[PDB]
Tab-separated table of C-alpha atoms and ligand atoms in Angstrom:
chain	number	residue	atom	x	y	z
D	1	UNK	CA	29.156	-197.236	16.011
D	2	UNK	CA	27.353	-200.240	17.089
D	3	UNK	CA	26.878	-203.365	14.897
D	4	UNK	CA	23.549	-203.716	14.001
D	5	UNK	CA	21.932	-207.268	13.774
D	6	UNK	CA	18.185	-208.146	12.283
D	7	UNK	CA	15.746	-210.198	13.918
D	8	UNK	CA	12.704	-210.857	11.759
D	9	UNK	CA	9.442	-211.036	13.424
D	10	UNK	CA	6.149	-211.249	12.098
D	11	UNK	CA	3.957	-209.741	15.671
D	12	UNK	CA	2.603	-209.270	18.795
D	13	UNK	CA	3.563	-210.671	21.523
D	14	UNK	CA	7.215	-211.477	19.746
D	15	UNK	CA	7.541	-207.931	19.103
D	16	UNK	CA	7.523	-206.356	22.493
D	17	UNK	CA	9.894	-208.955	23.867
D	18	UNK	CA	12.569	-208.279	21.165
D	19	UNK	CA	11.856	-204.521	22.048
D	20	UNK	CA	12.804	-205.587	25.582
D	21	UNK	CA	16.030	-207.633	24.289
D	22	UNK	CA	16.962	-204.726	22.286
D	23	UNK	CA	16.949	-202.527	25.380
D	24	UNK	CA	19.425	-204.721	26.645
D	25	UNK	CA	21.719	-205.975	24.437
D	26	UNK	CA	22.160	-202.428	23.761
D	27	UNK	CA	24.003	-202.586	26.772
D	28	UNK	CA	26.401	-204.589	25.632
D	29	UNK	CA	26.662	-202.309	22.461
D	30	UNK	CA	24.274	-204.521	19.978
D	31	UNK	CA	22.290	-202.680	18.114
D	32	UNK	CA	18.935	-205.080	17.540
D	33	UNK	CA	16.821	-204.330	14.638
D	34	UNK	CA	13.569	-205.186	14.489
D	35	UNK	CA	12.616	-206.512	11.003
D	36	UNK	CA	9.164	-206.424	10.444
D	37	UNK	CA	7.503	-209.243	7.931
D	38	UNK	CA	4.161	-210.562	7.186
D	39	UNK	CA	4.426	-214.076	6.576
D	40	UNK	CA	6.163	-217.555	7.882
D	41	UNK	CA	7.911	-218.392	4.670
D	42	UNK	CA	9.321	-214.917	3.896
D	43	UNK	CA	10.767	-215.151	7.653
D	44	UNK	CA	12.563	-218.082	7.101
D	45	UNK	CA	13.763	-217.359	3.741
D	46	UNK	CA	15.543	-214.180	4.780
D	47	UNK	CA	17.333	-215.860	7.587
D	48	UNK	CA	18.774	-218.707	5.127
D	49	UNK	CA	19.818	-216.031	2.506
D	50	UNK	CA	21.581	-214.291	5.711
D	51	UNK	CA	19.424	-210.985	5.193
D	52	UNK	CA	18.643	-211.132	8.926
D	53	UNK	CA	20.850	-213.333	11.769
D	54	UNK	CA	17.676	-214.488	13.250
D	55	UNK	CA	13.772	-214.468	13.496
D	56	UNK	CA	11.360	-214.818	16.815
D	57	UNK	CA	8.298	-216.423	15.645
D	58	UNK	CA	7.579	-219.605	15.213
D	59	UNK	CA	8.014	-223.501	17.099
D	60	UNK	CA	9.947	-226.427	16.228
D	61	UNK	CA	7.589	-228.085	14.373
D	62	UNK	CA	7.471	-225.590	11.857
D	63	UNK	CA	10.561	-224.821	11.476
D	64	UNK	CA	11.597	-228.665	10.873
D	65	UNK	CA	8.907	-228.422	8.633
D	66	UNK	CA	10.385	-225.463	6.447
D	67	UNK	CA	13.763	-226.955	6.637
D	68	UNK	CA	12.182	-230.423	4.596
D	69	UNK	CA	9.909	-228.318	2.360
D	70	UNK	CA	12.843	-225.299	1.440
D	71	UNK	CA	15.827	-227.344	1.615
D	72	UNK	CA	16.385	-225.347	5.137
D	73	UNK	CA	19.644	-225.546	7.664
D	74	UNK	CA	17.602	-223.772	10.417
D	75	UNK	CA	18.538	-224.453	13.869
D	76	UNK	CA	16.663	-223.303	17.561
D	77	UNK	CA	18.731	-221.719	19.707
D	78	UNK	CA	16.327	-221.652	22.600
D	79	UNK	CA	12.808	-221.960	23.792
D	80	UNK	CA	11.306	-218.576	24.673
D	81	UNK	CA	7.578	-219.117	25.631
D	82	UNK	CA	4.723	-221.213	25.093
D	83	UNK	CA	1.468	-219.545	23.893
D	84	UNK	CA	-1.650	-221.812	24.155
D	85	UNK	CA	-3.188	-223.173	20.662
D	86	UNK	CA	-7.465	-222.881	21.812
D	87	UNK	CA	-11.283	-223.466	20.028
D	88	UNK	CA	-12.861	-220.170	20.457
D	89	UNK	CA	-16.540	-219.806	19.350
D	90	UNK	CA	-18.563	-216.604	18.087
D	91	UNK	CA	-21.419	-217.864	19.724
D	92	UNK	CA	-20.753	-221.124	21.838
D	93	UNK	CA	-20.027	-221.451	25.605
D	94	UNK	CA	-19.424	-224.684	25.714
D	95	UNK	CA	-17.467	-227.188	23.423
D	96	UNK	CA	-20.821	-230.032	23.656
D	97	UNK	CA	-22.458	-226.743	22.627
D	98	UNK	CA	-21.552	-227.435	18.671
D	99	UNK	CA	-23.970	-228.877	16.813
D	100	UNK	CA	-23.742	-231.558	14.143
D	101	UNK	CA	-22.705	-229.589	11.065
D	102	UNK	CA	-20.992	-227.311	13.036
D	103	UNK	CA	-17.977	-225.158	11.016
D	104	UNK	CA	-14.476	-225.307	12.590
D	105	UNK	CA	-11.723	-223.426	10.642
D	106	UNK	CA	-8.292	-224.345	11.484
D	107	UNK	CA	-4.915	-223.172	9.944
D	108	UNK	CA	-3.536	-224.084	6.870
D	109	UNK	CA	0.266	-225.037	7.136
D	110	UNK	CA	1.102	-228.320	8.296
D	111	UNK	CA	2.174	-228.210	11.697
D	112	UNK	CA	-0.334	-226.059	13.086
D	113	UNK	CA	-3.002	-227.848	11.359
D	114	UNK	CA	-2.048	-230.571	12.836
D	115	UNK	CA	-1.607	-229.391	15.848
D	116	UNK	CA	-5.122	-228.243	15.842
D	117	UNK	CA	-6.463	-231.387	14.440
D	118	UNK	CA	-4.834	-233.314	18.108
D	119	UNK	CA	-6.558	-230.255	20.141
D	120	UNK	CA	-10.182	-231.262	18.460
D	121	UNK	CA	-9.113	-234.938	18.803
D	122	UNK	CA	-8.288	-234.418	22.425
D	123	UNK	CA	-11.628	-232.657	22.792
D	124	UNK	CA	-13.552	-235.441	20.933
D	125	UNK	CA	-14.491	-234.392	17.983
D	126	UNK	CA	-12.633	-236.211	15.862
D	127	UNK	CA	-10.131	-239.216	15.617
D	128	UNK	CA	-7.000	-239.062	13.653
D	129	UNK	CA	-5.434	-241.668	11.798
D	130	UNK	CA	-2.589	-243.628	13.405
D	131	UNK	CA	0.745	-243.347	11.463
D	132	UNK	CA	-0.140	-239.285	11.094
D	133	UNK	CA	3.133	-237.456	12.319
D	134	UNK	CA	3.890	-234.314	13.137
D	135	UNK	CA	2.652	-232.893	10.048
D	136	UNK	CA	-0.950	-234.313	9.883
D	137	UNK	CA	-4.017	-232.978	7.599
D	138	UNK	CA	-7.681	-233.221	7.532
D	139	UNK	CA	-6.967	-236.045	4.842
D	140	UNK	CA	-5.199	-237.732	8.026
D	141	UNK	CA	-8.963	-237.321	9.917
D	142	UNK	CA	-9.915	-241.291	10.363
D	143	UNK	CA	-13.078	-240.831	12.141
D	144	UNK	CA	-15.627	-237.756	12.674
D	145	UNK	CA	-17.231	-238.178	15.815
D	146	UNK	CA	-19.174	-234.455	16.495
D	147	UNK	CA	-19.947	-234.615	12.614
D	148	UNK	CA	-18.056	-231.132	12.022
D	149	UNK	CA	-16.594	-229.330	8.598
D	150	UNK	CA	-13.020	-228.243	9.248
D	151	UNK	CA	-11.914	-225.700	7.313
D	152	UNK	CA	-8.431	-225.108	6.531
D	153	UNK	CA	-7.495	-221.328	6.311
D	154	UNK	CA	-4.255	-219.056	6.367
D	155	UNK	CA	-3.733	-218.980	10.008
D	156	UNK	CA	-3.082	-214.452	10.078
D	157	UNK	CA	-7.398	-214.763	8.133
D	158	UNK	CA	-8.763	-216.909	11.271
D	159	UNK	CA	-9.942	-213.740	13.472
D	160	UNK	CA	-10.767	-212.529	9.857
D	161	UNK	CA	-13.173	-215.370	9.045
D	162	UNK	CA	-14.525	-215.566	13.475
D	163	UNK	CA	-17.828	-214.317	12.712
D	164	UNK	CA	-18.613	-216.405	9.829
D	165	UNK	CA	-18.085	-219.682	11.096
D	166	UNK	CA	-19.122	-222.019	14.182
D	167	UNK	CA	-15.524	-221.783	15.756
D	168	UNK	CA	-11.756	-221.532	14.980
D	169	UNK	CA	-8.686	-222.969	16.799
D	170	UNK	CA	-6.785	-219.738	16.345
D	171	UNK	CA	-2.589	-219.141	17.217
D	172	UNK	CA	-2.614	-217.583	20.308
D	173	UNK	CA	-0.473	-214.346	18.645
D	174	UNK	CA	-3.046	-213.854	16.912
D	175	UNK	CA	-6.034	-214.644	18.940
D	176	UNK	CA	-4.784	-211.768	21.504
D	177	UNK	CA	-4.239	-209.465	18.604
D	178	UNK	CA	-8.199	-209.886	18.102
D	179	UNK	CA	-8.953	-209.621	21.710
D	180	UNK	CA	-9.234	-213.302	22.355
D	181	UNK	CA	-7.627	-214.738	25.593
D	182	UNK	CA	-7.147	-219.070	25.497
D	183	UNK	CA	-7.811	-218.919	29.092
D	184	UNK	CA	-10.977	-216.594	29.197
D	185	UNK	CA	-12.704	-217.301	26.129
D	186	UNK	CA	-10.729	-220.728	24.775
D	187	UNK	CA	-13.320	-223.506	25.268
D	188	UNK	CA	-10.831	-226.196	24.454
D	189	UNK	CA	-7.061	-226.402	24.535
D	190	UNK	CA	-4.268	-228.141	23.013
D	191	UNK	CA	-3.346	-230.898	24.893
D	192	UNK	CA	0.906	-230.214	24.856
D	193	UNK	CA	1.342	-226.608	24.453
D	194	UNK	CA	4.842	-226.861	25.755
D	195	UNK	CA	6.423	-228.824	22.792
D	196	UNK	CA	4.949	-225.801	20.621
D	197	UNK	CA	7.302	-223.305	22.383
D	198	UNK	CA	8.898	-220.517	19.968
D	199	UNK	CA	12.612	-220.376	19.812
D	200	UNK	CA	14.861	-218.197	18.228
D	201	UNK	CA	15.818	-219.633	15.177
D	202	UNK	CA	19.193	-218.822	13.242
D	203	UNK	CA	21.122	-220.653	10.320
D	204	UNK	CA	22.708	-223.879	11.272
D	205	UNK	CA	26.532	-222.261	11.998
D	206	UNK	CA	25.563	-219.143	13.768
D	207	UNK	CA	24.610	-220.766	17.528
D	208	UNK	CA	27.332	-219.373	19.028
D	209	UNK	CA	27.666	-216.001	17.661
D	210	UNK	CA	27.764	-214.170	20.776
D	211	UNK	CA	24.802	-211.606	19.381
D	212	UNK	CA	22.224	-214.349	18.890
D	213	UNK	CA	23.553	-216.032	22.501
D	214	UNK	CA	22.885	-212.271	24.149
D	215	UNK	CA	19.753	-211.968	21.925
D	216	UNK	CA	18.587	-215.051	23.695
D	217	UNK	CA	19.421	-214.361	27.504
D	218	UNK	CA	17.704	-211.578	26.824
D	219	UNK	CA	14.533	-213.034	26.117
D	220	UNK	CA	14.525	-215.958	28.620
D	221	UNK	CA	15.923	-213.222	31.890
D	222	UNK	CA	14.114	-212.202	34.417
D	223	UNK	CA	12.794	-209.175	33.166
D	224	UNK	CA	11.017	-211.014	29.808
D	225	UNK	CA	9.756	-213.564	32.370
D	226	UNK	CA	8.616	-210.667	34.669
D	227	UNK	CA	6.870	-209.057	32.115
D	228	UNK	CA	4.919	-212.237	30.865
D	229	UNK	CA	3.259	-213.377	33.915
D	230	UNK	CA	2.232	-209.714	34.566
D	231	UNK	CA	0.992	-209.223	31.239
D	232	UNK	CA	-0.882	-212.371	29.970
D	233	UNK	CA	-2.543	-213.323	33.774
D	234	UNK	CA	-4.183	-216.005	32.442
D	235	UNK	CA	-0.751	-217.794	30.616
D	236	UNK	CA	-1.673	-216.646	26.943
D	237	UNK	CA	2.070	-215.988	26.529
D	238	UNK	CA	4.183	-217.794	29.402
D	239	UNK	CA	7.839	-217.920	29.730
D	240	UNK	CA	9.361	-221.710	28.431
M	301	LIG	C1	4.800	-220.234	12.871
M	301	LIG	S1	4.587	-221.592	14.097
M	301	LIG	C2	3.303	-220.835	15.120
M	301	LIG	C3	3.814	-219.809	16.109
M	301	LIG	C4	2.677	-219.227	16.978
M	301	LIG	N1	3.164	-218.014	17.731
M	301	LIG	C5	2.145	-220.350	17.895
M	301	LIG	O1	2.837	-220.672	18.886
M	301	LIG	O2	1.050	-220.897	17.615
């Protein structure tokens, strides 16, 4: 008997905190279903044809990003958490540890490689053009100071591709899906990881259906907060 609403999300850590939303907006009789996809445009897609009310996965950014690319009317609702964009290294301690040459991949759609590009830039090894934006490339690189080959690569392949390269600034999702904690292992971090908070995103029109709003103080209460700062110690996942 009670409605049922989607929520796409593509995985971990998104997907235990809509498990613990769903626990409780089944309280208030919503039934949340967790829609299970495996890449950002698909997510989007399916929440501007209306197959799903919402999705948990990505930042701002991004999603300002798919709106100019697709033609998109996606709106946040809400910051949820913050999850710390790092350099992790197969090998390397220590960021003056890379040596002239050295391999860096770094994702592969536009606001996370850029994003990635200002973490390296922040930690020297590069200088970016000026007039770059939000949605800055390698071809936006002006200056390389370490003398490094950045590699662009689907951002889900990064822990895929680890051993083979020098380093990779890797999503935190899914950096602690492969073991890797920013804190313990990072060896450089993004210099503003709170304007890359995730927010639950729904079509421009639906803010205020009462679902999405319970949907949402469900995932910023006490008992998502609770759960992050026990979890992820070292603020891998931290409440927004
Ligand atoms: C699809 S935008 C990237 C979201 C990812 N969880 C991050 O904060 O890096």
């Amino acid at each position: 008997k009670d409605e049922t609403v989607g929520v796409g999300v593509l995985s971990e850590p998104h997907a235990r905190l809509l498990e613990i939303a769903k626990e409780e907006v089944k309280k208030q009789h919503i039934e949340l279903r967790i829609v299970e996809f495996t890449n950002y445009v698909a997510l989007n897609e399916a929440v501007m044809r209306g197959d799903i009310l919402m999705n948990f996965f990505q930042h701002v950014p991004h999603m300002q990003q798919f709106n100019q690319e697709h033609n998109g009317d996606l709106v946040s609702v809400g910051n949820v958490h913050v999850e710390p964009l790092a350099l992790y290294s197969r090998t390397y301690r220590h960021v003056s540890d890379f040596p002239a040459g050295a391999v860096i991949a770094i994702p592969n759609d536009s606001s996370n490689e850029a994003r990635a590009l200002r973490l390296l830039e922040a930690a020297g090894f590069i200088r970016m053009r000026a007039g770059s934006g939000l949605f800055a490339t390698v071809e936006d690189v002006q200056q390389n100071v370490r003398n490094v080959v950045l590699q662009e690569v689907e951002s889900a392949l990064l822990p895929r591709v680890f051993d083979q390269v020098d380093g990779a600034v890797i999503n935190g999702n899914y950096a602690i899906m492969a073991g890797l904690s920013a804190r313990r292992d990072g060896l450089a971090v993004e210099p503003d990881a709170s304007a890359y908070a995730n927010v639950l995103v729904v079509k421009r029109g639906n803010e205020a259906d009462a679902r999405v709003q319970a949907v949402l103080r469900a995932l910023c209460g006490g008992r998502v907060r609770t759960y992050l700062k026990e979890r992820y110690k070292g603020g891998e996942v931290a409440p927004a």
